[PDB]
Symmetry: C2
Subunit: 126 residues, 2 copies
């Protein structure tokens, strides 16, 4: 009936993910997200490197109290002589407009209302 | 042909597991183990608490260069006001005797040869 801000989408982890070994093969860590709002929301992901890490689905439209699974694969590598404290993800979302279209749009961020965003610290466990 | 010590069984993680959130439901973390020896080996697991944590299969007989999956479930709880630095697992194994029987025996530890054992530090990520 009245205005409705972008409900804080639940996240698990909420802000701390330690990619547990081994690093000898692409390890896809499943993430849990949920829409804690009243209406749908257009969210997108961004990582320091879109080559090594692979987040899918990168962008999508969640529903009211809808649950979705994420996949963050990490290509193999050598953590014996490589710094591991510069990897961080970004998850933002904004309430879609009245009867928005069926497709993530960039206008949803340059329109009315406010957009939320939180970076998730990455970790590497051996 | 000649004597054969208990090949160091590969572990992933090898000595560091951070049970990533959430803690609102039994989360079973899959572990990777492998027999790096020439013959089978009888191994067993032990945790500080056999009530909260559940490791299965607890004991079994691995084969030469055989891979096996483990399941370490962790009952839900509240990590907002509970110490999380006293949980540690124990994985030991000893080369089975010549044509050993098809069933983990305790005599394999009180016989000839040497037995290996390593504790895996537990962690809790929110």
């Amino acid at each position: 009936a009245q205005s409705v801000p972008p409900g804080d989408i639940n996240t698990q982890p909420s802000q701390k993910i330690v990619f547990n070994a081994p690093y000898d093969d692409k390890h896809t860590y499943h993430i849990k997200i949920t829409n804690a709002g009243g209406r749908r929301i257009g969210w997108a992901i961004k990582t320091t490197n879109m080559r090594r890490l692979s987040v899918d689905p990168p962008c999508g439209v969640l529903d009211p109290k809808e649950k979705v699974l994420m996949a963050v694969s990490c290509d193999t590598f050598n953590a014996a002589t490589e710094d591991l404290n510069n990897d961080r993800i970004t998850i933002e979302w904004t309430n879609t407009p009245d009867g928005a279209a069926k497709q993530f749009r960039r206008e949803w961020f340059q329109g009315d209302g406010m957009v939320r965003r939180k970076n998730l610290p990455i970790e590497y466990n051996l």
